[PDB]
């Protein structure tokens, strides 16, 4: 029985998600193309010349779907399960994540400022909802929390002024505060712990996050996968329904599951009969994102007592260039050579926030010294660096309207643009979301489902847990 030809571009979690579902269904007429030598995309891991494994920034596995959990169990045996121990370095103190719920750990005067400003913003009411993320967190948390944490931290990570960001992506990312709880915490010095979908997470014992997608790759039919730099897609002809690669090859498709960046897709896709086609270049120009610099510092010995069981740490202040540090050796003993530990640092970059790359590593090290991560006597054996051009899809004001101008037109022509940058929706931008966007796209294409829940209803997916199992486990 011959079936429509499905081509997948990209072997990150989204693409592999589509491939896995097809495999589960026993579908035969499909092929996946990837221009990297290795599966995983932004979820790959790297082994440096000194024996240190690196992820591309802190990655931890936590799932909103039974399906993805099953896939993880199926792909990888040997998981470490950890309770999140995450902190914020601010005003000379270690404050438990989330900052806003734990202001009792601030020095007295900062704590008083945070509480008082929180009381004052409770006393202020408004006719209309906030127009942007900054107005939103300022009204919600008060000027104390905003000044000490929300504003400097959010610029430091997003590399975009938060006043240019929308407000509805925050549901599972920005914890709310309760004034009565906060006052009680202050009376009792009682930490407020365990908030959020990654309060518990898991991480592979060996090979970093990338081992997951390597194992997945090895489970799929090898003949249906292509990993080669010549297979970078550089033109989509939607009339002829072909994909032209950088090596000059041309292949046809009935359906295209594209996980390349949405801006890249719009600029390389040509055809007739697309409504609004002439606007595509302006749409692509308006898609806001930040780049991500990953710096891996390998250190002799063992981490200091205050970092013994730390996971990831946040740095709102200008004494460090990185917004986050991960004690990556605490996820697995095998991420480092014996007798060492490691810090994985993240520095954002954009048009609003340029980076001097020639001084970046040394600046990170100076930042570690100033932020209680390293001491002058620490011995550094590895200084790894990796720059991601497209790191975060900014939830910028106007994003949905831009997306709605092209996405339904692409889909009506059998082109499904999905994943972290394929759909450009940060709030469903993690590994489980991405993987499931691939699974769901296949379901839609094959008529098993009438809608794609994850990419279309971020609120629904993150408010519940999907219960359906993965059959190959």
Ligand X SMILES: Cc1cc2c(cc1C)N(C[C@H](O)[C@H](O)[C@H](O)COP(=O)(O)OP(=O)(O)OC[C@H]1O[C@@H](n3cnc4c(N)ncnc43)[C@H](O)[C@@H]1O)c1[nH]c(=O)[nH]c(=O)c1N2
Ligand Y SMILES: O=c1ccn([C@@H]2O[C@H](COP(=O)(O)OP(=O)(O)O)[C@@H](O)[C@H]2O)c(=O)[nH]1
Under rule CB under 6 A, residue 10 binds ligand X: yes
Residue 42 annotated as part of some ligand binding site: yes
Q: Annotation-wise, does 331 bind a ligand?
A: no
How far apart are CB 10 and ligand X at their closest, in Å? 3
Helix (H, G, I), strand (E, B) or coil at 17: helix
User: By three-state DSSP, how is residue 163 classified?
Assistant: helix
If the CB atoms of residues 141 and 201 are measured against ligand X, the closer one turns out to be 201
- Contact mark string toward ligand X, 53..92, x via CB under 6 A: ---xxxxx--------------------------------
Residues 432-461 that bind ligand X (CB under 6 A): 432, 434
Task: Choose between 32 and 361: whose C-beta lies nearer to ligand X.
Answer: 32
- To ligand Y, the closest distance from the beta carbon of 321 in angstroms equals 16
ω before 98 within 30° of 0 (cis)? Answer: yes
Give the residue, chosen from 7, 8, 9, 114, that forms a contact with ligand X under the rule CB under 6 A.
9
Rounded CA-CA distance 337/236 in Å is 45
Give the gyration radius of the chain's Cα atoms.
23
Residues near ligand Y, by CB under 6 A: 88, 97-100, 154, 157, 173-175, 314
DSSP β-ladder status, 233-237 and 242-245: antiparallel
Residue 64, CB half-sphere, CA atoms under 13 Å: how many?
23
Q: If binding is defined by CB under 6 A, does position 430 make contact with ligand X? A: yes
Paired with 292 in beta bridges are 348, 388
Q: Is 5 within 8 Å of 253 (Cβ atoms)?
A: yes
List the x/- string, 306-325, binding to ligand X by CB under 6 A. --------------------
Contact partner, 317, from ligand Y, ligand X, none, Cβ < 5-8 Å per class = none
Nearest residue to 322 (alpha-carbon basis) of 159, 92, 99: 159
Give the C-alpha separation, 103 to 113, whole Å: 10
Picked from ligand Y, ligand X, none, the partner binding residue 233 (CB below 5 to 8 A depending on kind) is: ligand X
Note whether 462 binds ligand X by CB under 6 A. no
- Residue whose C-alpha is closest to residue 329's, from 315, 306, 309: 309
Select from ligand X, ligand Y, none the partner in contact with residue 316, using the beta carbon and a kind-dependent cut-off of 5 to 8 Å.
Answer: none
CA distance 296 to 302: 16
The residue within the footprint of ligand X, chosen from 6, 7, 13, 303 (CB under 6 A), is 13
Residue 461, marked binder: no
**Nearest-angstrom CA–CA distance, 307 and 375:** 13
Instruction: Encode 251-297 in three state secondary structure.
Output: EECCEEEECCCHHHHHHHEECCCCCCHHHHHHHHHHCCEEEEEEEEE
The reply on whether position 427 binds ligand X by CB under 6 A is no
Options 429, 461, 466, 470; binder of ligand X; rule CB under 6 A: 429
Q: Binding site for FAD: what residues are annotated?
A: 14, 34, 42, 60, 233, 420, 429, 431
As annotated, the binding site includes: 14, 34, 42, 60, 99-100, 154, 158, 233, 314, 324, 392, 420, 426, 429, 431
- The contact set with ligand X (CB under 6 A) reads 9-15, 33-36, 41-43, 56-60, 232-233, 259-260, 292, 346, 388, 391, 419-422, 429-432, 434
């Amino acid at each position: 029985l011959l079936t429509p030809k499905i081509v997948i571009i990209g072997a990150g979690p989204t693409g592999l998600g589509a491939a896995v579902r097809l495999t589960e269904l026993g579908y035969k007429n499909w092929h996946l193309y990837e221009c990297n030598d290795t599966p995983g995309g932004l979820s790959r891991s790297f082994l440096d010349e000194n024996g240190f494994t690196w992820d591309l920034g802190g990655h931890v596995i936590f799932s909103h779907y039974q399906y993805f959990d099953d896939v993880m169990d199926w792909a990888v045996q040997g998981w470490n399960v950890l309770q999140r121990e995450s902190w914020v370095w601010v005003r000379g103190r270690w404050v438990p994540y989330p900052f806003q719920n734990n202001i009792h750990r601030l020095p007295e005067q900062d704590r008083k400022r945070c509480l008082d400003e929180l009381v004052r913003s409770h006393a202020r009411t408004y006719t209309e909802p906030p127009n942007n993320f900054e107005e939103s967190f300022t009204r919600q948390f008060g000027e104390g929390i905003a000044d000490i944490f929300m504003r400097p931290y959010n610029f430091k990570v997003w590399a975009v002024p938060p006043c240019l960001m929308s407000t509805e992506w925050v549901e599972e990312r920005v914890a709310p505060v309760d004034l009565e709880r906060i006052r009680r915490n202050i009376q009792e010095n009682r930490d407020d712990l365990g908030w959020g979908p990654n309060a518990t997470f898991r991480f592979p014992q060996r090979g970093g996050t990338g081992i997951i997608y390597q194992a997945i790759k090895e489970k799929l039919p090898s003949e249906k996968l292509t990993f080669n730099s010549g297979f970078q897609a550089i033109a989509i002809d939607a009339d002829a329904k072909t994909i032209t690669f950088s090596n000059g090859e041309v292949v046809s498709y009935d359906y295209l599951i594209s996980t390349v960046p949405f801006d890249n897709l719009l600029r390389m896709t040509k055809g007739t009969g697309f409504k609004g086609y002439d606007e595509w270049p302006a749409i692509a120009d308006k898609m806001v994102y930040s780049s991500t610099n990953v710096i891996g510092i390998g250190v002799k010995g063992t981490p200091p007592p205050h970092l013994k069981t730390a996971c990831w740490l946040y740095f709102p202040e200008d004494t460090s260039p990185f917004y986050r540090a991960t004690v990556f050796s605490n996820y697995s003993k095998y991420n480092v050579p014996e007798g060492h530990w490691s810090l994985m640092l993240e520095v954002s970059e954009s048009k609003y926030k340029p980076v001097n790359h020639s001084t970046l590593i040394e600046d990170c090290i100076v930042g570690c010294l100033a932020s209680n991560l390293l001491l002058p006597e620490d011995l550094l054996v590895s200084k790894w660096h990796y720059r991601i051009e497209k790191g975060y899809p900014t939830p910028f004001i106007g994003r949905n309207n831009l997306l709605e101008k092209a996405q339904p037109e692409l889909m009506s022509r059998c082109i499904y643009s999905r994943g972290r940058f394929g759909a450009w929706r940060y709030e469903v931008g993690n590994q489980d979301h991405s993987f499931m966007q691939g699974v769901e796209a296949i379901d839609h294409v094959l008529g098993l489902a009438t809608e794609e829940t994850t990419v279309a209803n971020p609120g629904r997916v993150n408010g519940t847990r999907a219960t359906t199992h993965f059959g190959l486990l």
